Write a structure and sequence with these properties.
Chains A, B: In conjunction with another transmembrane protein, CNTNAP2, contributes to the organization of axonal domains at nodes of Ranvier by maintaining voltage-gated potassium channels at the juxtaparanodal region. Chains A, B: This is Contactin-2. The structure is a homodimer of 574-residue chains. In chain A, the strands form 15 sheets. In chain A, strands 2-10-9-5-6 form a five-stranded mixed sheet, with no helix packed on it. In chain A, strands 11, 13, 16, 17 and 18 form a five-stranded mixed sheet that branches. The radius of gyration of chain A is 49 Å and the shape is rod-shaped. The first copy, chain A, is mainly beta. Chain A has six domains: 93 residues, Immunoglobulin-like, CATH 2.60.40; 90 residues, Immunoglobulin-like; 85 residues, Immunoglobulin-like, CATH 2.60.40; 86 residues, Immunoglobulin-like; 78 residues, Immunoglobulin-like, CATH 2.60.40.10; 95 residues, Immunoglobulin-like (Sandwich), CATH 2.60.40. Helices cover 0% and strands 48% of the residues of chain A. The two termini of chain A are 83 Å apart. The structure holds a molecule of 6 linked components (NAG-NAG-BMA-MAN-MAN-MAN), a molecule of 5 linked components (NAG-NAG-BMA-MAN-MAN), a molecule of 4 linked components (NAG-NAG-BMA-MAN) (2 copies), a molecule of 3 linked components (NAG-NAG-BMA) (2 copies), a molecule of 2 linked components (NAG-NAG) and 2-acetamido-2-deoxy-beta-D-glucopyranose (NAG) (6 copies).
């Protein structure tokens, strides 16, 4: 019960915190294999030395990296479970390192404007992977900006937009990035910039958008998307969201600068418009949400057994907005269209399979948004010659000068080459002997010099087999004195003789038939008699012959392995 | 030209910031030594195996640790400068690593009490070296606890004390530590615990202090100290700070739970009391601020050369509030009171120094607040006798029948064994001649038969030396006729005679003094006369004697190498 490796647990991307919770990362990998599978690991498309005492160690099937490093172990990892049958690759798992550096200590320039205008204070946050929440601080660290409708902190660029510079906005402002997500609370603030306010300018301002959203925003199904839109206007501009020829949703307020779509569906695709309006004017900005999707299987291959030289068509299909391109792998290696097998994107056609094509195959569909794998095992079924059924027959009795037919019926996956040999001597097509196509051995005019062992030898790709039989030449049961025809009247007696000879070792049985009817000489009220049976001679006496006791009589002198026969014609008539 | 090692640059403790600028730390160490010194390094009291390609590199004695690690290189470091003369230890420099891990992800159990009572919510902050600033959050992260006087966050344990559990205090509370140091804005908060509020208890509560300060708070002059004091009392307890018997300072508010002494002086030492008072009662807590100080030298040892078998008293003294305990080190190893040398706290007495005692010595004074070192070199001097610096009296005039003392004081490591020889014959303690203990040769009742060469032979461990001097005693200057006293009237003349004898080879000079005043016989308008000087006789004539021309006259007849003297008393009368 040997089979190829089947993945049970596969790797999973991991975000490794920098603050050192543990000094080890364990990427999982595990496979069912009759002969336990050996696991190899490939980072960034290159083998990893997992020998003992190395940093990149192995525990069962799981890859353990000690003291993970963002500069050394960040990137892709792949598991290859292999065994005598073949090799299979697992999902690609990304090891990413989350962190949050601190703000550059370089002093931040101050910003100065007339009171009553709008202004922007930039955050310019430091390098960070997992994601940030941007807030702003006034003067001292504990104190926070008054969060209202006149202020808005962009949570993509971190900047701070003030629609109307108020007299109370004269002070110092710093940025604060907080990486708060599922795991991690690290938070860092920046050097304080300063906001200077000149004389007031009560002059009314038509709304002008300064926090815009991208013209093209690509997101995947199930993901969340957020659009930002904020403007400067002396009356706090009211922000409205709409969809170009779209009903939108009633539950969403759609009144704040941030439009939030959780679990973006494909229907949420399309053009969106933001409008910032105030008593003195209005401004607008538009942009498209272009929904995309990762690959997902539709049809895939399955473990299959196929006879040698068969035709096998395998197909894998996948769905995804960027049309997933499909590829094939044999034992974890690129499978190009070989001589025996044709490869065309999603179809793999084996024409006249061979024993070499068996093994582990995989179809892999990828787009710019990722990759997916599906594996299966191909078993081409061979078979050595087997004589378990239809044997050659241990004993072959014959008769002097008779014909003999000895069958040979091996069963082998590819057609078995057959040969016949008597003792140690091979046999061919002679005048007397014939080795037919089907395999039967034909011997003609047999003599006692042919007695012996005859063996059939069968072979093929896989193996060889042989079977023997004994050949025993006996005397032929023969009729020495045969009865001829006769003509007789009704009421008169007739005698048909049959003088035969046979091998003494065997008993002899005489039979008399009449137009294929068994002459019942023991019939109630019959009209026949079998003469005194000596082992050589047999006679049939018809007493009180009648018109119905005539026809083609047949004498048949048989032994338990041989028989001879003669025919006579009896005509009654008066 | 060879001398012991003298430290010029010494190591310095270092706080390695989290996410430093570079991944290398250079602990300085350098020593002046005529034959360049070898530098050894000791981490946590264990030798360090350094090399170029190793992590622990060396550059001019300075220790460079690449990619510093808190788990591998945190702790004490010491430099040992060694050379043929000896070994010396450097200051202890601590390499510490500042950081701030995040709170344990395990959810923290809720705390429950009766409404109107006081309560404490523990922070249990994560591992951290540098000081932290603890605040608390209510429900969500942006929102902060209202700091008003009913709440108090201990900035030593991080806990949160609520004096009166108010109906509005029912909610979720988390701790937030901010690790603000030289460069760091890191801030991490904990998973939210929950506060459960039972039925109200309107009964007033007598104040009970729960956030106390230690009875003994140890601090150094110039440092800052902070005392915390907060209590539970149903009426918001008023907190007052005072000193049991000190005028204290007006600038300090003494109204908040935290009493702050920046730059604590020695006068700020003493007992302090905090008083929490409310309508229904009062409670107090007392404790002493005990000002202390680090060790600082007062007297220390110095580089010394000492002759073999000398007595050497060394002393090192130090000042510090915990009296610094003094120890000694020989070539960087503990110097216990051995057989030859006595050690008593701050004093080290070498008795009969030997060639083995040379080397580098150090005195090390330590108290609970640190350690201080002072080094010096001890050179024990061997030396053969040398007379180049103090040769023997090359010329020795004396007087017939007089006593002669000829010193012999060579410069030798151990005192030189001395012998005296005239010509080729050695001298001992005879009736006239004696070879004294100090080494001086004493000759008595000398005659012209002793004139000749006298040589001192000195020896010691190392070598032998000798030096000669001529002895030329020719005759004793003697007074044959001495003047006696006299009594005279004013206006009359007096004559004081002095008849002397001298060796013919030398001239003779007469001197007349009057009560240690040189009788000026060439005085403008004087009243003296020195008679006609013959080489044998000298007379002083006082003409027109006066009350001021009397007293103890002294005749002094001298040659340039010998002299005799006599004294008379002249009494004038009016
Ligand atoms: C106390 O009593 C002692 C005992 O008498 C007396 O010491 C004697 O000092 C004199 C010099 O003042 C020594 O005379 C020297 O003798 C050596 C040879 O003697 C040595 O070798 C023999 C074997 O050959 C040994 O048996 C013996 O013990 C000695 O070890 C001479 O070589 C010396 O000559 C040098 O100085 C001359 C100038 O006067 C040079 O012209 C001459 O070239 C020699 O100089 C060499 O060395 C120089 C470097 O130092 C180099 O620059 C030159 O170019 C040259 O190569 C010298 O005549 C006598 O040996 C000592 N006695 C003993 C027993 O050793 C002390 O003088 C006396 N104390 C006082 C105060 O006088
Ligand atoms: C016709 O078909 C029959 C039945 O299949 C064959 O009989 C078998 O033949 C094979 C191969 O000759 C035999 O296997 C061989 O056994 C040798 C030892 O023989 C002893 O042990 C067996 C039991 O294992 C006894 O039956 C036998 O009487 C002996 O006591 C091994 O030495 C052989 O290995 C050697 O040769 C092979 C290559 O053949 C090498 O790879 C090896 O390294 C080694 O050098 C081999 O294992 C088998 O034992 C036979 N049957 C039985 C029941 O034993 C006939 O051979 C076949 N005839 C023809 C002409 O095709
Ligand atoms: C294994 O494969 C992963 C994935 O490809 C790989 O991680 C990648 O490393 C490169 C280079 O370090 C990263 O490229 C960066 O891209 C950002 C913008 O996205 C740039 O700001 C970065 O700038 C660096 O490089 C510049 C070019 O010289 C420098 O001027 C600059 O100062 C920075 O040093 C950099 O170009 C890429 O983002 C990652 N991708 C992922 C998914 O991690 C990893 O490095 C590979 N393994 C090894 C050992 O290299
Ligand atoms: C050189 O010697 C110094 C001095 O011993 C040594 O530093 C010491 O390390 C131990 C263990 O790291 C410290 O023991 C700590 O005690 C405090 C109590 O104040 C505990 O809170 C600490 O708990 C933390 O560390 C544990 C590790 O044992 C963690 O399991 C735990 O979760 C906490 O994170 C800890 O037990 C000891 O205080 C210091 N001593 C000094 C003076 O700092 C240093 O490690 C040595 N260096 C080398 C390279 O050997
Ligand atoms: C040894 O002699 C025997 C007997 O002649 C040979 O068997 C014969 O082989 C031929 C060659 O293929 C067969 O011809 C075929 O006949 C079938 C119909 O049976 C026909 O459909 C084919 O197109 C082809 O013509 C012939 O049938 C067969 N004899 C019998 C009785 O079946 C054998 O080939 C000889 N061996 C060698 C090695 O020469
Ligand atoms: C403070 O912490 C407590 C937990 O200690 C928070 O209570 C939790 O509140 C959420 C909703 O805000 C509850 O979720 C609810 O779950 C029930 C099923 O259990 C479901 O029917 C509701 O639709 C909702 O999803 C959660 O169960 C609850 N936890 C417990 C243990 O009761 C609380 O929200 C936090 N904030 C406060 C109190 O302001
Ligand atoms: C905002 O930052 C400025 C400096 O950029 C602070 O101005 C300093 O104010 C102190 C008074 O506490 C003066 O001693 C300094 O000379 C000022 N420096 C400069 C460059 O002007 C200002 O105080 C900060 N904001 C607030 C509210 O204090
Ligand atoms: C803004 O300016 C107005 C001026 O009328 C003032 O009343 C108000 O207190 C200031 N602060 C805020 C937060 O609006
Ligand atoms: C049969 O074989 C024998 C011996 O080979 C031969 O004498 C005889 O004539 C043969 N008979 C026929 C019918 O071929
Ligand atoms: C036939 O047998 C019967 C039996 O008795 C006999 O009567 C008759 O004569 C026989 N006929 C011939 C022709 O043998
Ligand atoms: C505390 O409780 C009192 C009475 O229940 C209430 O008046 C007061 O506002 C509360 N404190 C707050 C809400 O900060
Ligand atoms: C007498 O001379 C001997 C020999 O030099 C010396 O050892 C001894 O000390 C001398 N005694 C005195 C009293 O000087
Ligand atoms: C000194 O020595 C001389 C000669 O031996 C002798 O005549 C005289 O008496 C001695 N005087 C003294 C005081 O020793």
């Amino acid at each position: 019960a040997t089979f190829g490796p089947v993945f049970e647990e596969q790797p999973v991307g991991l975000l490794f915190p920098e603050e050192s919770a543990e000094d080890q990362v364990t990427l999982a990998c595990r496979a069912r294999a009759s002969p336990p599978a050996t696991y190899r690991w490939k980072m960034n498309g290159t083998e990893m030395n997992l020998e003992p005492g190395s940093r990149h160690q192995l525990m069962g099937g799981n890859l353990v990296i000690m003291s993970p490093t963002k500069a050394q172990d960040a990137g892709v990892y792949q598991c290859l479970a292999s065994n005598p049958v073949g090799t299979v690759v697992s999902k690609e798992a990304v090891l990413r390192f989350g962190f949050l550096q601190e703000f550059s200590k370089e002093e931040r320039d101050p910003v100065k404007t007339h009171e009553g205008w709008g202004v922007m204070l930039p955050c310019n946050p430091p390098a960070h992977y997992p994601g940030l929440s941007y807030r702003w601080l006034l003067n001292e660290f504990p104190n926070f900006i008054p969060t209202d409708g006149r202020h808005f902190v962009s949570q993509t660029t971190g900047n701070l937009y003030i629609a109307r510079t108020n007299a109370s906005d004269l002070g110092n402002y710093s940025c604060l990035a907080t990486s708060h997500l599922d795991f991690s609370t690290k938070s860092v603030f920046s050097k304080f910039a300063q906001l200077n306010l000149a004389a007031e300018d009560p002059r009314l301002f038509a709304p002008s958008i300064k926090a815009r959203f991208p013209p093209e925003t690509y997101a995947l199904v199930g993901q969340q998307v957020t659009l930002e839109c904020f403007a400067f206007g002396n009356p706090v501009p009211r922000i409205k969201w709409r969809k170009v020829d779209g009903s939108l949703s009633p539950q969403w307020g759609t009144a704040e600068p941030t439009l939030q779509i959780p679990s973006v569906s494909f229907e949420d695709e399309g053009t969106y418009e933001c409008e910032a309006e105030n008593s003195k004017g209005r401004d607008t900005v538009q942009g498209r949400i272009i929904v995309q999707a990762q690959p997902e299987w539709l049809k895939v291959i399955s473990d299959t057994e196929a006879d040698i030289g068969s035709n096998l068509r395998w197909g894998c299909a996948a769905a995804g907005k960027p049309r997933p391109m499909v590829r094939w792998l044999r034992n974890g290696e690129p499978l190009a269209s070989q001589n025996r097998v044709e490869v065309l994107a999603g179809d793999l056609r084996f024409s006249k399979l061979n024993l070499e094509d068996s093994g582990m195959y995989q179809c892999v569909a990828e787009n710019k948004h990722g990759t997916i794998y599906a594996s299966a095992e191909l078993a081409v079924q061979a078979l050595a010659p087997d004589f378990r059924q239809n044997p050659v027959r241990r004993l072959i009795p014959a008769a002097r000068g008779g014909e003999i037919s000895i069958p040979c019926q091996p069963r082998a996956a590819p057609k078995a080459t057959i040969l016949w040999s008597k003792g140690t001597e091979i046999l061919g097509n002679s005048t007397r002997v014939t080795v037919t196509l089907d395999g039967t051995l034909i011997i003609r005019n047999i003599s006692r010099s042919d007695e012996g062992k005859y063996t059939c030898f069968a072979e093929n790709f896989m193996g060889k087999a042989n079977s023997t039989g004994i050949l025993s030449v006996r005397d032929a049961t023969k009729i020495t004195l045969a009865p001829s025809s006769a003509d007789i009247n009704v009421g008169d007696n007739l005698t048909l003789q049959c003088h035969a000879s046979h091998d003494p070792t065997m008993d002899l049985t005489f039979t008399w038939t009449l137009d294929d009817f068994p002459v019942d000489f023991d019939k109630p009220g019959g009209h026949y008699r079998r003469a005194s049976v000596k082992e050589t001679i047999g006679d049939l006496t018809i007493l009180n012959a009648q018109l119905r006791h005539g026809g083609t009589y047949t004498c048949m002198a048989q032994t338990v392995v041989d028989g001879a026969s003669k025919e006579a014609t009896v005509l009654v008539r008066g």
